[PDB]
Structure 1
Amino acid sequence: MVISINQVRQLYVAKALKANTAALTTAGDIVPKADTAKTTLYFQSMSPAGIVASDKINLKHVLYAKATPSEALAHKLVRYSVTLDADVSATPVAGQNYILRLAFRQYIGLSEEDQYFKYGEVIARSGMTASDFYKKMAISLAKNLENKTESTPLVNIYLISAAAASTDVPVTSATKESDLTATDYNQIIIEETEQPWVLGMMPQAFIPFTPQFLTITVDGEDRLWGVATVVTPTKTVPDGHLIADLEYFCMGARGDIYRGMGYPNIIKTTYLVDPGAVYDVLDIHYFYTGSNESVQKSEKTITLVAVDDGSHTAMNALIGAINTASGLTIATL
């Protein structure tokens, strides 16, 4: 997860807020320090290897300072709703191959020229009601998607009974028609997947898809048999991994930039972000100017991250202390 920096970006984790530097005992403790006036701002950050302190911010040269509510970083899993097109026919027509084409973008590569396609097949029979078609279609999708010898997990198939309308029922390549017993299956849902993630190696990413349909011959003409709707999602990624990869990257601006390259001959760096939690982020921008001829600026970003208990309590405590010690008015969350 390499990012772009305005001449630098630094990160410090706030696992606990203290009043003085004589109280920085644990390896996440932080405290904002500033003059009795308002001339410089810096933070005393307790590292796993002793106290440290951020760069010194000239408060005449603070450009912007703003926090985030920890929900602007969650990625909602793109959810779809497949259905028979009533216009063509509200039921399958016997003797027709109701194929479905799952077009995938951002497959192994990172561009969209990198595409991948996965199909489903359902040959309709006489008396094949709609629920049975969705059942057999979902199963064909699962089977063709998750063959035990298929590396990447691409999508999660689901089904919804018109009775519930909310509780989506899963469909795996291990699922059997015997397990799907209802008869009022209204539609087929398809959803994204949290691809595998590795700290510093494999960034948080997703494979976008769109269900594309194939033509069938209804009374006399070739027509698409379904409808691919983009319904509102219900599942998110909790932002834990973005911050972890952010710290991993932003602690090389403050230390070992090799992070394992010459393996036996490396430095071991500790990280205080728990990937599995959810964080609210504070970010400060500023710059440094020199004297007579050295007027050029050097803009900088000092970044903080706290833990979101759902009420933005810790980040609010930070902002309170920073504004009390700096005269700033960073808006609370």
Structure 2
Amino acid sequence: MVISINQVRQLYVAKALKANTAALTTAGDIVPKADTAKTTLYFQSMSPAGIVASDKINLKHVLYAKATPSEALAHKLVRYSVTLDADVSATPVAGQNYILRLAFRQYIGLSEEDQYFKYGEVIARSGMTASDFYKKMAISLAKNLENKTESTPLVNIYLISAAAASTDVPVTSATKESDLTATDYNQIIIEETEQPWVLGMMPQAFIPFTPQFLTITVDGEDRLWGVATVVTPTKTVPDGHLIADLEYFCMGARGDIYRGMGYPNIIKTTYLVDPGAVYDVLDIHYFYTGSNESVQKSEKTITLVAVDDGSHTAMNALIGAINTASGLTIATL
């Protein structure tokens, strides 16, 4: 993906801490190097084809040096609690068509003018309980949205019973009426889905929606049918696909600017980030001033990325190594 930069951004992956340049053995190692007079900070990093350093950070010219946890870069897949509005009728009115419209907004193109509209439908009948209704509409909402033949995954749709009320039973295009055997269904949960991701060419982007109801007559009045309230999300996508795209962009600042343009003829850069793991980010943002009447700042930033194992041990060892060599107050997260 393409990001915005403050005039440059270069990324190093902190796979190891070796404390000196003579112990750099495998690819992706990191030492934070500085001298006794704490005026320059740089990172002798072991690339897959030798040892390489960074631009030399003047420690009087840092602006912010903030390290972020891996929980702060997870997109929370939003949910909606679709229920029966009890003000119109607590029971499904036995003759009406009960239709619900999903209004998607990023479709196959980014603007909110590229839209997509999908529907679920249940004819309500006499004696049909509300639990027999949500058993009948989550199937009809799954047959249109959780289908096998759609172009892109749109939503994930569950049912919530009144007994458990915390676990979600998934409803798909293959689930029948006999598989969902429960008589206390009270809502339909419509959750976002993670879209497909390709390294460098297809960024991590999502499709939002809004469950909108249609009008069903009660005593002559065409009253809107239901209510949809944004309940708190319980599923998040990891940081694996943002940092995997972040090494793909920032390697073109230190290296070749094009990536595959003409393929008998490219410089194959080997990347170090596994896209299947979560990662922490540390951004040392600084500048370069001179000594003249033309002095002021050419602003820069250096991103260091270490692997996150649950309690951020591989990142905090890097912060604990930068704090002693350079003497900065980077907050150990």
TM bracket (short chain): over 0.9
Post-superposition Cα deviations, 1:78-133, rounded to whole Å, max 9, x if no partner, equal 01110000101111001100000001011111010111100011010100100111
**How far apart, CA to CA, are the structure 2 residues paired with 1:277 and 1:19?**
25
Post-superposition Cα deviations, 1:250-272, rounded to whole Å, max 9, x if no partner, equal 00001111111112111101111
User: What is residue 277 of structure 1 aligned with on the other side?
Assistant: 277
Partners of 2:146 and 2:156 within 8 A in 1: no
Offset, 1:331 = 0.9
SS at match of 2:70: coil
Q: What is the Cα-based RMSD across aligned positions, in Å?
A: 1.0
**How far apart, CA to CA, are the structure 2 residues paired with 1:283 and 1:146?**
40
**How far apart, CA to CA, are the structure 1 residues paired with 2:256 and 2:9?**
15
SS at match of 1:79: coil
* TM-score normalised according to structure 1 size: 0.98
Partners of 2:84 and 2:227 within 8 A in 1: yes
Offset, 1:156 = 0.7
**How far apart, CA to CA, are the structure 1 residues paired with 2:312 and 2:29?**
18
User: What is residue 166 of structure 2 aligned with on the other side?
Assistant: 166
Residue correspondences, number? 333
**How far apart, CA to CA, are the structure 2 residues paired with 1:148 and 1:232?**
28
Offset, 1:46 = 0.7
Post-superposition Cα deviations, 1:221-260, rounded to whole Å, max 9, x if no partner, equal 1111111011111111111110010010000001111111
**How far apart, CA to CA, are the structure 2 residues paired with 1:27 and 1:146?**
43
**How far apart, CA to CA, are the structure 2 residues paired with 1:105 and 1:35?**
54
SS at match of 1:98: strand
Offset, 1:159 = 0.4
Offset, 1:60 = 1.1
Residue correspondence of structure 1 range 228-247 to structure 2 within 5 A: 228-247=228-247
Give identity over the alignment, percent.
100
Offset, 1:166 = 1.2
Offset, 1:43 = 0.3
User: What is residue 186 of structure 1 aligned with on the other side?
Assistant: 186
Partners of 2:101 and 2:117 within 8 A in 1: yes
Post-superposition Cα deviations, 1:31-65, rounded to whole Å, max 9, x if no partner, equal 00011110100001111111111110011111111
Offset, 1:148 = 3.3
**How far apart, CA to CA, are the structure 2 residues paired with 1:67 and 1:231?**
30
User: What is residue 133 of structure 2 aligned with on the other side?
Assistant: 133
**How far apart, CA to CA, are the structure 1 residues paired with 2:252 and 2:26?**
22
SS at match of 2:183: coil
SS at match of 2:322: helix
* TM-score normalised according to structure 2 size: 0.98
Partners of 2:100 and 2:211 within 8 A in 1: yes
Offset, 1:210 = 0.9
Offset, 1:287 = 0.5
Q: Is 1:76 aligned with 2:58? A: no
Gaps of 5+ in 1: none
Offset, 1:149 = 2.7
**How far apart, CA to CA, are the structure 1 residues paired with 2:45 and 2:138?**
53
Post-superposition Cα deviations, 1:284-304, rounded to whole Å, max 9, x if no partner, equal 011111232431321100010
Partners of 2:146 and 2:155 within 8 A in 1: no
Offset, 1:146 = 3.7
**How far apart, CA to CA, are the structure 2 residues paired with 1:9 and 1:18?**
24
Post-superposition Cα deviations, 1:144-176, rounded to whole Å, max 9, x if no partner, equal 224433111100110011111111111111111
SS at match of 2:22: helix
**How far apart, CA to CA, are the structure 1 residues paired with 2:29 and 2:300?**
23
**How far apart, CA to CA, are the structure 2 residues paired with 1:162 and 1:292?**
74
**How far apart, CA to CA, are the structure 2 residues paired with 1:149 and 1:328?**
55
**How far apart, CA to CA, are the structure 1 residues paired with 2:269 and 2:228?**
47
**How far apart, CA to CA, are the structure 2 residues paired with 1:39 and 1:187?**
61
Gaps of 5+ in 2: none
User: What is residue 56 of structure 1 aligned with on the other side?
Assistant: 56
SS at match of 2:157: strand
**How far apart, CA to CA, are the structure 1 residues paired with 2:53 and 2:150?**
48
**How far apart, CA to CA, are the structure 2 residues paired with 1:206 and 1:66?**
27
**How far apart, CA to CA, are the structure 2 residues paired with 1:66 and 1:297?**
20
**How far apart, CA to CA, are the structure 2 residues paired with 1:215 and 1:200?**
45
**Runs of 4+ residues over 3 Å off in structure 1:** none
Partners of 2:147 and 2:172 within 8 A in 1: no
